[PDB]
Design a protein around this ligand. Structure first.
Ligand code: ZN
Length: 183
DNA sequence: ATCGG
């Protein structure tokens, strides 16, 4: 029930400038009792520390660590929606671990909305394709998703969502890139 | 300004 600072949101989820951090706004909705809204929240990655020897944990793994805390009923079907700053990586095992989670728990269906494509990982295409081939929806965040996260996850205090310059442009471009990757 | 130093 603790919301997100507006400057952090507009700083990390900017699809024009790529940040050195990753945030993840997750929703968990029950499907068919009646369809309900059961869990919402957000988290961020754990920064890698060279001096202490810590390699860091990306936001996807940070969410996979939280799944036991959700008390998901194995008899019902849940839809998990991600609004992640960077697309999940491959070289560091995130896409593989998410695919592993999706295979053990077939009652959970995941859809991922990425604000930016993590093309720093040379195998980002293999990550997105692996996520698609595992039954998870892979999409790029558009204005509707940014405004949604602003209205439900951000402590806006009544201030409406003011889109940054190039939101629709970069969102369309990344949508085209992802459409070209998932062929 | 690409999961940070
Ligand atoms: Zn990762």
């Amino acid at each position: 029930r603790h919301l997100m600072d507006p400057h952090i949101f507009t700083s990390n989820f900017n699809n024009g400038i790529g940040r050195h951090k990753t945030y993840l706004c997750y929703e968990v909705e029950r499907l068919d009792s009646v369809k309900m809204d059961q869990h919402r929240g957000f988290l961020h990655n754990q920064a890698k520390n060279l001096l202490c020897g810590f390699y860091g944990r990306h936001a996807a793994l940070r969410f996979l660590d939280l799944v036991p805390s959700l008390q998901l009923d194995p008899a019902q079907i849940y839809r998990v929606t991600w609004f992640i700053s960077w697309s999940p990586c491959f070289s560091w095992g995130c896409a593989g671990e998410v695919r592993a989670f999706l295979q053990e728990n077939t009652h959970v269906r995941l859809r991922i909305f990425a604000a930016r494509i993590y093309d720093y990982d040379p195998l980002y295409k293999e990550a997105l394709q692996m996520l698609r081939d595992a039954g998870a929806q892979v999409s790029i965040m558009t204005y509707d998703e940014f405004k949604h996260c602003w209205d439900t996850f951000v402590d806006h205090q009544g201030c409406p969502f003011q889109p940054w310059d190039g939101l629709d442009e970069h969102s369309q471009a990344l949508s085209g890139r992802l459409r070209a990757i998932l062929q």
